[model samples]
Target: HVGTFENITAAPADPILGLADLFRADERPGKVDLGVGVYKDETGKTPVMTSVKKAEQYLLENETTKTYLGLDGLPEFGRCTQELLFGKGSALINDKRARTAQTPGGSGALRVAADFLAKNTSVKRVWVSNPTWPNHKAIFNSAGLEVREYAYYDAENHTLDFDALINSLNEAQAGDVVLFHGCCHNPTGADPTLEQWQTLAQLSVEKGWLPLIDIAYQGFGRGLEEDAEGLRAFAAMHKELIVASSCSKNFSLYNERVGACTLVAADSETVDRAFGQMKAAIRANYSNPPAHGASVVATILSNDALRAIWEQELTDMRQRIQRMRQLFVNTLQEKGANRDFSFIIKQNGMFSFSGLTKEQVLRLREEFGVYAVASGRINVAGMTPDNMAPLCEAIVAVL
Candidate 1:
């Protein structure tokens, strides 16, 4: 007998994407969308990177078939990405202690890493930031791991609650997994200082807990090397670590879904075991990742001229975001609002927890057609020179 599907229920709309939908339907000429996560230029457009375009041209000119990569993914893509994460000639790469496998995207990498931990290790609980990317908890929970929260951003003070965070981590058991934003902490955009990262590294060593670094916006926060300092520091101290990185934002290949998952082990034996398990995880799930995105990234990084072009383009994007942050803060000051928005300048990457209440956010969206998350998180990249003045005015009116 056939069964009816009456028991299934509809899931609620995603907050970010829902906001985007509403913004799109508004039809207001001056409507501003500060809810989406992707980077937008001064013209309010998301354009393809020069290096990516050139790389695609190269791939088109060269002869190749639409063949499948191994379960471990394209070998060149893995090697290039590993070097990009952990610099060339580094001890980890030279010692053959590091390995990377191409995944669909950063989200895919996170899910695969979580599953690997759940299947291969004794970890039952994963500790994430209290106000982290909404998907972090979902991804870990989907992998059948218990999700716990650690104090990260202090919304009341609009700053990092380092003491509370450290206290929470201090109480965790040895076998638990700790998820960290290698750089540019999402939602809040609050990152620990180099010294603070050192302290966390020491704690991991003392407590025997595993570190999982998720880096989605590598070059958006700071210069590539500067943003990678925390991850490199962790690698230097911890013999075993998991890193999930994405080229979506930096490479402007959001639709292509390019990313990697890397495992750093103490010895060749451990690396071999980890690599095999990771491959098995990939095979059971997606069989193998697509090739176009990985090929584009590999081509860019492997060529000197293309590499320089990519770096320069990334730097331009970073500078544009920084400039917008300054403009937003300066405009707010010029309007003489009672509240201080200096925290905007302090936050890094594409987002700023604007400290606006949920009610204010609703008011801005409904009354002024200025869209932002209910949590007050605004994508700084969404504010171009054209929309800066109106955005500031809308914010001031709400305040």
Candidate 2:
């Protein structure tokens, strides 16, 4: 308290976690929370998957020590992560053009990517979607890089504004980095179709901008392979690409924070050099990666039966989101809604631009105890049969 630190006022609360604290303090028995971005089950809890539990048991019985996992983390985790991103027998894998460094989470992976771009490459700017994850700009800028936004979500229509997206991306220069959501775009849940992704990948090649695809909600969007389809397109077209992949959503490993930052270059030697540089950035940051979460991921992905169990469990989560979307629109229609909420059904992932105004969001929170982000974004995964009727009632009343 005697130092210059006394001059510093407390930082403002985080947009999401601040709301989380408010929601926790509310005593309303019927209050609903759609703010936090996590997969919830029928009982409204984020439960660990069966495969992950089995893997933990195996590790508990067989693991030897708590030694450091080096700057890059577990080898099997990298192998499994790359295989999920690029698929088996991929050219990137076959040619040895891809190198993955496991980080704390997707957040940590982005930090390593930011530092790598800031220190290793000539790129100084990163372009992300206008309404991407709130932490994106912070991560890139923390490494002394400028962050820019490109048009993406069409809030009025609740769709991907691809034309505006292209127009804005056209201004990106060579050596600049552009971030794309691999699948299930956060907050908006809007995503580019396969054809659009193909076009974007080709454009990145012609435009000469470095592509960084973040696959946070992979299996939550679609099937495991389907979710990474766009990422694979980038892998196929771009000579060099950066991917930050996460196990938080798919594996229910949120607290464990296991993710990977994969660098793909034109050739094996170049990728090797980039990876060495990545290791140094990581060394200066956290020194080395944590071992348990990655071990859980690697154990499941590397084992056949366990992998199968994980896949099926993820499929259920994905279907629940889709079903929730369906239920959202259906119940509104039943309530004689004049506005067409059918658009929700088409948006993939756990989020949607629920099309509510900031004022309406406030009313929903204050009047009905229904909580959501002010961006009008709501978590579709937060919906359940018990809360569906009253939640839609609150929304319908607001509209």
Off by over 4 Å in 2: none
Model 1 regions more than 4 Å off: 2-4
Residue-level lDDT of model 2, residues 1-399, one tens digit each, is 489877898888677787888899999999998886788998999998899999999999999999887899999999999999999999999999999999999999999999988998899999999799989988998999999999998888878999999999989999999999999998788889999999999999999999999999888887888999999888889989999999998999999989999999999999999999999999899978999999999999899999999999999999988999999899998876779998898888998888898999999999999999989889988899889999998888889
**Which pairs clash (backbone N, Cα, C closer than 3 Å) in model 1?**
none
lDDT of each: 0.89, 0.92
Q: What would you estimate as the lDDT of candidate 2?
A: 0.92
| Model 1: lowest-lDDT 10 consecutive positions | 1-10
Candidate 2, pairs of clashing residues: none
Best by lDDT: 2
Instruction: State the TM-score for model 2.
Output: 0.98
Report the lDDT tens digits of candidate 1 across residue range 1-399. 555876668888677677777887898889998987789998888999989999999999994788886877889999998877888888999899988889999999999998888888799999999899989988999889999999999897889999999998877889898999988899888999998899999899899989999998888888898888899889889888999999999899999989999998998789988989998888889978878999999999999999999999999999999999999989888876678888888888998798999999999999999888888889999898888888899889988
* Deviation from native of the Cα of residue 312 in model 2, angstroms: 0.9
